[PDB]
Chain A
Amino acid sequence: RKTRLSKNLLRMKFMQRHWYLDLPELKEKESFIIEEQSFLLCEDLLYGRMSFRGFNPEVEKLMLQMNA
């Protein structure tokens, strides 16, 4: 008798489908100003690829999605 499969079959593919340091001078410190070069954090912007009344409705749903 038997109830379960075998392994050699159950392997096939169609089936599966350091250290640290404490500086009292600089232990609990954090940067107060940070250098950025991105106009996004800086400023809000829409999604590049868009469309107006019909061309590539896929881009229209992308607009609806990413612009909120």
Chain B
Amino acid sequence: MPRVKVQSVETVEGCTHEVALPAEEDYLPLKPRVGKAAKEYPFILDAFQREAIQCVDNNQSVLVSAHTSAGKTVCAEYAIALALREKQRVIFTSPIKALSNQKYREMYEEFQDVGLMTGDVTINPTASCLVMTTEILRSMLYRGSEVMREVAWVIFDEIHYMRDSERGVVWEETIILLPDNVHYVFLSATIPNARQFAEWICHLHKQPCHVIYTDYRPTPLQHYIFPAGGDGLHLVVDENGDFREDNFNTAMQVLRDAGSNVFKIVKMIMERNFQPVIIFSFSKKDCEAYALQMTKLDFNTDEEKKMVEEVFSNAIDCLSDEDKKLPQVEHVLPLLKRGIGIHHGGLLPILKETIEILFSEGLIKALFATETFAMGINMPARTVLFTNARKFDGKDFRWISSGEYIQMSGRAGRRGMDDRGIVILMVDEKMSPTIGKQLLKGSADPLNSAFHLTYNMVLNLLRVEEINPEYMLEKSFYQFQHYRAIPGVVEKVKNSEDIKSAKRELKKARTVLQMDELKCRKRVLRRLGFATSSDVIEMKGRVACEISSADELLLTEMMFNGLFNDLSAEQATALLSCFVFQENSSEMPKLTEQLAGPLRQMQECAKRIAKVSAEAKLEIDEETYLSSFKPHLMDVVYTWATGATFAHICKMTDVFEGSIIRCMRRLEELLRQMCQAAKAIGNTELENKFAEGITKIKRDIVFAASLYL
């Protein structure tokens, strides 16, 4: 089993500091700085931050779990400057793209030596500091680019975003791939299992790591409830953490007695001078309709309106004269004049950046935003209101999770300006003190990993000789997290000192999980030509590895069965839209033969893959796999590639625009990848075809610049 030694240090109240180190190396604590400081700060650093800096000085990796808005980004800048002092290179992994652009703008303002990498652009890569997403770094680690041998400091933001299902593999794999001679920082939110994470990093790098945890916060919050029609906000918990359910009981009584509302709430808020306010509604039509309702009011002067017109024009002047004549632009601009804004992943990103900037200024007070602000921005406010607790994620129409409740509440509270922040929660249902308590005061949800094996992983790992998957699985978090749950039946057996479990769980104490899926993936790869006996690659593998933005087995089969070799330029774009697009729509479309026929061959190949998957028992279903690919935008993309107008396009489908933009950007990425694949096998007509399609897509707005850049 993994031997590991964890320890605590004698410090003062304000935080908690604990180390995790190899089980056979004694502990000699950190040492004070030597010489000048890397970056002097105008103010005085908390114990939290100065401990982080003291750790970063002695060249030791760290974990930092503290609520947002606590200047958690200081350790990052210190590390960056320290690296730029020793000629080293440093890296900053931010999954989001817009957050990455913001961090790049900041680091560029400050240090003048930075470089951005992202799916859309690339800047000054010969920079001692590289800001970018994580998947880029994954591809690097695979292809051992010229960076891993130079960068000594990595810094991760939003590891808690690893708790998801579709992307929690990336951060893990990246960590497993980094070399022992690296150092790096983790900047998370509150998570109670930090000790396990640190032990994992240690046993994984044979390196010591530090952990800082604190509930500290500069702007304490006050939570209130609003029941339907109560016309009165009821306190529940106070700054001091004193939860008083007396008012909560009164609120429930009002609920029971009850048997154009959020408007009333915002009017209250503004009469209280509690502005500005954020509004978290877990949908899109609701946000938009609330904005429509509240258009009547005005929370700005006239000079502010002229100034907003100025900035808005200076921003959307980068577009054409026609994209200006777009219904969203017009039908929104007055809402911005009036001081209310809306933000959700269904807009054009131009207006999104515009609104985020305006909010950073203060030219809009009430903002209807669902979950974007919750994660990837530093733009706090004075008060926040939850339109309702319920939401949708994955499949379940679950209640709100304390983790997300707090991730959003952290928004409220502007340092300096606001002596405190006002959270409010709307309710229209009986909710006894248990659920309300575990929601409001309950602690965050732990950081469990997903670590679902994937094709790309297996193939890109078969390329290599020194690294094999079994290693990956035995080094992951999903495995290291199955050694503190082991003592249970092990303790039962120790008592027994039943024996069936003894034999089995003793031969399964330090063993591997999730192997059967690995063997089945291998079997598929063999049956389809993507590998061979002896577990070695085949041409198909070196064609699929180049693809990462979609299902690559089926793309390679489409190639090696001769589909794109007979079609035209755009039809390929459409058949790829059939993959990037993953949303449902109301009305399935009617498609012409020239454009539909190919999809039938696509579905035949899909059925073949499904049968080959079922033979090996991947617990897979056929109907889903086949229907997981929505062609609802084939005609959209066709007409777009014919060189048409975005307004002549947003109509054909009852879908928002931002989804189209995401579709098309992923599509262009996939086209670059397919060009490289054709470049690999040896064909040229196909790569010219795909490149021409790319040249057809990018016209006006799907690939505009980021105002933050």
Contact = CB atoms under 8 A, between A and B. Distances in A.
B360 A9 contact: yes
A23 interface: no
Contacts of A6: 361
B707 A17 contact: no
A17 B317 CA distance: 9
B512 interface: no
Contact of A5 (B307, B317, B318, B708): B307
Contact of A14 (B109, B307, B317, B360): B317
Interface in B318-344: 318
Interface string A14-46: 110100000000000000000000000000000
Contacts of B318: 14
Contacts, number: 23
A25 B303 CA distance: 70
Contacts of A17: 314, 317
Contact of B361 (A3, A5, A11, A15): A5
Nearest to A6: B361
A9 B307 CA distance: 13
A11 B707 CA distance: 11
Q: Interface residues of B: mostly helix, strand, loop or mixed? A: helix
Contacts of B612: none
B311 interface: yes
Q: Interface residues of A: mostly helix, strand, loop or mixed? A: loop
B693 to A, nearest CB: 30
B314 to A, nearest CB: 5
B71 to A, nearest CB: 18
B315 interface: yes
A2 interface: yes
A2 B307 CA distance: 12
A2 B317 contact: no
Nearest to B307: A5
Given A14-B707, A15-B311, A9 B317 contact: no
A3 B363 CA distance: 10
A13 to B, nearest CB: 8
A12 B358 CA distance: 13
B589 interface: no
Given A12-B707, A14-B318, A15-B311, A2 B360 contact: no
Given A5-B361, A9-B360, A14-B314, 13 more contacts: A2-B362, A5-B307, A5-B311, A6-B361, A8-B109, A9-B311, A9-B361, A11-B109, A12-B707, A14-B317, A15-B311, A17-B314, A17-B317
12 contacts: A5-B307, A5-B311, A5-B361, A6-B361, A9-B311, A9-B357, A9-B361, A14-B314, A14-B315, A14-B318, A17-B314, A17-B317
6 A-B pairs with least C-beta separation: A15-B314, A14-B315, A14-B314, A14-B707, A14-B318, A6-B361
